[PDB]
Amino acid sequence: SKYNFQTAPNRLSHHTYKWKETETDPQLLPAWIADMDFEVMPEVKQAIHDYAEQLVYGYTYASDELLQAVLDWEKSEHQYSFDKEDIVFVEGVVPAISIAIQAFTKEGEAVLINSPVYPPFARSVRLNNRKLVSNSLKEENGLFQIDFEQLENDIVENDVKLYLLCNPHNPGGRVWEREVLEQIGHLCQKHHVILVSDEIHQDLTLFGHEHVSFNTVSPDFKDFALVLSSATKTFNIAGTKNSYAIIENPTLCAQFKHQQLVNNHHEVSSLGYIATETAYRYGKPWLVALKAVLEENIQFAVEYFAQEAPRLKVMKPQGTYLIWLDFSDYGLTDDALFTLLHDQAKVILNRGSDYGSEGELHARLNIAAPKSLVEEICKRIVCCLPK
Amino acid sequence: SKYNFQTAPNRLSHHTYKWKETETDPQLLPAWIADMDFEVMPEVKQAIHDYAEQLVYGYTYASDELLQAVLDWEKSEHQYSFDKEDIVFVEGVVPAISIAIQAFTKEGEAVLINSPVYPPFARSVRLNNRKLVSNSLKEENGLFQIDFEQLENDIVENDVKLYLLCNPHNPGGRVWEREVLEQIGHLCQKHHVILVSDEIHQDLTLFGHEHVSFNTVSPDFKDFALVLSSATKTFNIAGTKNSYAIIENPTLCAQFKHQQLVNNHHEVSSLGYIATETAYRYGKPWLVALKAVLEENIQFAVEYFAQEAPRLKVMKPQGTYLIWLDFSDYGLTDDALFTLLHDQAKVILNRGSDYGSEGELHARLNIAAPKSLVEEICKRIVCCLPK
């Protein structure tokens, strides 16, 4: 218990998204947006104090030490070896997604996602005036799976140019096996599709599930695929605004960097650089401790819901700290479910329908909070469900 | 008991752009990129420490207190009154310029600048595949002036859609009079041109020169013009990454915000928000003290160069902390001037030619450093100039 996973810091004065509603209605307990109600690792807090003590807060660049820290993290944690020149810093992963869409496709061309998925995927495609192709995931034995026949159909019928892959997949928390990723890659090679693998949850695979970074699947995958990740989801530092793309293919790397500069989206803040380097240098023990806490919270929620709401269908995450809940067996509409949870149960969960039509009558639950808070949130979710 | 403008914090370990070359060649003295070698106001330092003590560094948004701080600053310092909903935060001004180009013009359409000017102006136009129209500034009696006859010709002959205005103008530090701004505005009305006024140096007008913010010139100007500014240049906090657009016209504001979201360039870091609010709420006395130091440094440089290098033509800034130096009386090429300053004099100044063809044989000198450092830099500049 060296690190504090037992007590949530009070965030009410910090202008957070997560606790905003609670500031007006103190009864509301938020468990929606993916940041954590855990204190950040102490080395990052110290690094922010140390930044203050620089005294001058001018223009800074991404250092060789930061580049090496990213290289070292990827090698040590994900067995992914590349060169410092392959790293492109971006203030966030969602920014990187828009840059990729703009760099690798033209207006009107088709971009494929596996639905239901993180809403900025569909939004970034549509707002960019690209054609969205939603490849609907199957649900079998409590897990999402890809229908590869329909995936190929979706690619061919729509002349898909870009595939935005989520790995681990949010929502659901699906940690794709190497064999699944290999089939995806072969389809991209066949049909000349560029693949962007959003691996922001890569450090949060649980219960023995192992993240397989996309370009580690086959040595040639870097010819068409790039990887996005960050320290921010792993270490709860989203407000520091830094992330990266690993782009080993020279042409793809130049294309991305060019579009990033066209958009004047090439700079990152000083603390963005500092916090990522610090997290990667010092964060491993904290991450190990976090993952044990997350596993306990998830197991608790699954068992509690099984006992108190056996009609509630719970997808057990293989990774991420987010649980996908299916209220389909209840006599509720999508809107009535939202009103029930928010107004009667006083719990704020993400509306599943935000993620696509497959999310109708679902909600997403964030369990990256102390066990006592998770216990209360689960109690509230089961309190008011209709007979 | 008073603010420190006498000693410069050591920056060699902070991965700064400004001191980067000096990290490898200790002989080199930088006076190029516009950040200051002055300690930032103490309250911003404290705000960074306070941010560390939030303990959780998750997702945040722009608070009503920050919005009010910007409103209050704009009203009290620039007599510019508008509503909180007119403010759009962007991680930087150069980001905002690209968003504006993309939002308000189509590919192939013409964008006008007054050359020579801050290089990202020309770059952002060119990289965006817009046609660049450079309206060349006159130089008369040591000051840049607009040729309004040619400006109108440039607008009409090229069907200009967007005018990127720099006010105060960098380089040269020209603080455009109200009457000059009114003539520009009237041309934009006549010819249906949208105008973006980059007023990042607005708080740094000197020697009795007063900034006139563009939309304060006429109540009609908001129909076609928006204002970009920031706390970063004023208060030496560029690394914190926040700035704003004031867009009073509903259509222009929606267009800008839409494009910002298309580009996923809508979020700002938590410290970005914090540092700007803090600077505006506590910064005025520091700024008053700064301006006295800057005037002293500029006066020193002008007089020193007048004695030690009478052939060197020095444009005295009306604002900004940057001096535009003209070496055209010397038997030098643009390349030879750069080599002389950098390799013999051991000083790093911005290359004038970066700013446009009018900057050939020029260099830009940054005097926002302690007087003792400025004295040394000036001594170096005059040491090795050829007969």
Ligand SMILES: Cc1ncc(COP(=O)(O)O)c(CN[C@@H](CO)C(=O)O)c1O
């Ligand atoms: C697949 C994926 N890609 C990107 C991000 C966020 O990226 P950014 O913070 O780097 O922009 C998230 C976090 N998503 C959070 C925050 O919105 C959530 O509530 O789901 C994500 O799940």
Ligand SMILES: Cc1ncc(COP(=O)(O)O)c(CN[C@@H](CO)C(=O)O)c1O
């Ligand atoms: C007219 C103008 N607009 C914008 C900026 C910087 O804007 P940003 O840092 O907010 O993107 C500057 C600072 N310019 C610095 C940093 O490059 C200089 O050395 O000139 C500027 O002079």
Ligand code: NA
């Ligand atoms: Na659908």
Ligand code: NA
């Ligand atoms: Na020119």
